[PDB]
Design an enzyme around this catalytic site. Sequence first.
Site, PDB file in Angstrom:
ATOM      1  N   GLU B  57      44.363  18.795  43.552  1.00  0.00           N
ATOM      2  CA  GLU B  57      44.368  20.140  42.418  1.00  0.00           C
ATOM      3  C   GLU B  57      43.953  20.913  44.171  1.00  0.00           C
ATOM      4  OE1 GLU B  57      41.940  21.519  39.066  1.00  0.00           O
ATOM      5  OE2 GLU B  57      43.428  20.863  38.602  1.00  0.00           O
ATOM      6  N   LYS B  59      41.996  24.124  44.191  1.00  0.00           N
ATOM      7  CA  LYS B  59      41.642  24.850  43.715  1.00  0.00           C
ATOM      8  C   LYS B  59      40.562  25.448  44.519  1.00  0.00           C
ATOM      9  CE  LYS B  59      38.732  22.637  40.560  1.00  0.00           C
ATOM     10  NZ  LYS B  59      38.264  22.647  39.196  1.00  0.00           N
ATOM     11  N   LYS B 119      48.687  24.876  36.595  1.00  0.00           N
ATOM     12  CA  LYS B 119      46.874  24.500  35.947  1.00  0.00           C
ATOM     13  C   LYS B 119      47.167  26.057  35.326  1.00  0.00           C
ATOM     14  CE  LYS B 119      43.539  21.290  34.903  1.00  0.00           C
ATOM     15  NZ  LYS B 119      42.690  21.075  35.728  1.00  0.00           N
ATOM     16  N   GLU B 168      46.324  18.241  27.272  1.00  0.00           N
ATOM     17  CA  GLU B 168      44.639  18.354  27.617  1.00  0.00           C
ATOM     18  C   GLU B 168      43.691  18.006  25.980  1.00  0.00           C
ATOM     19  OE1 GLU B 168      42.736  19.884  30.854  1.00  0.00           O
ATOM     20  OE2 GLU B 168      40.874  20.856  29.217  1.00  0.00           O
ATOM     21  N   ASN B 189      40.136  14.961  29.393  1.00  0.00           N
ATOM     22  CA  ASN B 189      38.726  15.834  30.148  1.00  0.00           C
ATOM     23  C   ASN B 189      37.830  15.612  29.532  1.00  0.00           C
ATOM     24  OD1 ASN B 189      37.889  17.652  31.622  1.00  0.00           O
ATOM     25  ND2 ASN B 189      39.541  19.156  31.184  1.00  0.00           N
ATOM     26  N   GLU B 219      40.134  13.519  33.820  1.00  0.00           N
ATOM     27  CA  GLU B 219      39.997  14.694  34.225  1.00  0.00           C
ATOM     28  C   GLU B 219      38.695  15.043  34.169  1.00  0.00           C
ATOM     29  OE1 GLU B 219      42.215  17.889  32.110  1.00  0.00           O
ATOM     30  OE2 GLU B 219      43.656  16.291  31.614  1.00  0.00           O
ATOM     31  N   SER B 220      38.500  15.802  35.784  1.00  0.00           N
ATOM     32  CA  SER B 220      36.992  15.986  35.482  1.00  0.00           C
ATOM     33  C   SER B 220      35.710  14.857  35.858  1.00  0.00           C
ATOM     34  CB  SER B 220      36.613  16.797  34.623  1.00  0.00           C
ATOM     35  OG  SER B 220      37.349  17.898  33.943  1.00  0.00           O
TER      36      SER B 220
END
Lengths: 259, 259
Positions: B57, B59, B119, B168, B189, B219-220
């Site tokens: 990603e 970001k 995103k 998500e 997530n 994710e995360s």
Amino acid sequence: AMILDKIFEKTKEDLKERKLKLPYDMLGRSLASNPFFPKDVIKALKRVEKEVKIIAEVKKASPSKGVIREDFDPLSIALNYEKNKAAAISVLTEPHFFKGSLEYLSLIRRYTQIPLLRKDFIFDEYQILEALVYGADFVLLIAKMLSMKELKKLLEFARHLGLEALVEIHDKEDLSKAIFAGADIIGINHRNLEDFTMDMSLCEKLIPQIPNSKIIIAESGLENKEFLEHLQNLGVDAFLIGEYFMREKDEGKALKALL
Amino acid sequence: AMILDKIFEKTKEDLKERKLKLPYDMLGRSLASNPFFPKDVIKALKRVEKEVKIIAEVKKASPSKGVIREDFDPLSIALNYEKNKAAAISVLTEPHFFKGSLEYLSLIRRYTQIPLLRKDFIFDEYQILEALVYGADFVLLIAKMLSMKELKKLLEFARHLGLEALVEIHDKEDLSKAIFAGADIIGINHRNLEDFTMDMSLCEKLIPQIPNSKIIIAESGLENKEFLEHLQNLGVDAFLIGEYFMREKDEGKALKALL
Ligand SMILES: [Cl-]
Ligand SMILES: [Cl-]
Ligand SMILES: [K+]
Ligand SMILES: [K+]
């Protein structure tokens, strides 16, 4: 602290401004192959005074009549139409009965600067994405062949790609569907979709039921300027005309004579 | 009822064949500026054996951390990600809280040959048409942010442009929305997007409720190789990793070390 809610709210307010700077109808169409910039379909078709707006149709054949023009050059036809002040051009893309081609729309797009109608039998989103990519500015939808829900869905998909739609109607049931589905452009077609018979008083009968906000198109059996002016007086904005021009040697001369 | 039914039936038959030769996902993404040809999103993300597939990603900043990388070069990051065998690249396009940009997506598209995720916080068809035009191959849909009907509407619109969707989820209600909408890429997530708390056991709880034929993204909070292997054992296909790479000096080497 509801971060997601805050981000959504900001994204919503910014989205309003983005759409004003780049509307739906420029976002999608600008990547089709217009030589310069996409044209406003509604402004092209809206009659302002008494001027004759004609959507001139590139049509080699018809189910009822067979081949209409044996020496068919769709690019040449389109150029002559625009040269002779057509408001827009209808391109038959149906291959089997009308002997059109989706490639004709792409070829014509590259050399024209007025709106193009994909004239075909559309019931699926893929065909509307095709129309966008191949260079149409609006698509034909036939109210008799689509449920109320399906028509509204396809109208909405077209709008979300930046495409307008001509919704063809033949009776009051069709019109009720078109209005409830939110059609912006309504085409009154004089020819019966099964028996090819003509009801040339259909505009008198249906226009009193069409909302003020709509562009009104008349199609089929148009071949005389005096009748066009009569239909204007009833409230028609523009006229879709194909066979009358395709029967003539000089389709551009036949178009000019009707203006 | 005769000729119009015949025409529609032949058009439907032809349309099936046409879709096999030019699928939705090739017809639309031809509008974008891929250097060569659009890539298959599902095959990019589907884990075949135990290979590590990472959606890396791009970001700059985040609501919980502030600016993660002051010296932010999104194109250079994307190139370094692809060089070091990212399966796909996620481009943050939200400008206010993440300091991304839709233009970063378009710039990255011209110089990358792997799928790109837009995103952002998507709730409207216009943003998905944007994603198509600007070069995304799939879009993020946040089930917590959308009603069940609205999630399905936007997923279908993405599909009708040829874009996939990463839906998500954070709980079983999110999953129920994803199932109704027909999602086949589902992202679990770990982060609660309202209070930015973290549940690192979420995959264990939710994956048994997902058909393993779906593409499952985690994710995360992903930072070490050993936990990724654990998540693969639970059935995760691919991993969405951003902050860990962005806070490192050499994001490409940090990505390579997790493979
Ligand atoms: Cl060319
Ligand atoms: Cl360039
Ligand atoms: K050419
Ligand atoms: K460039």
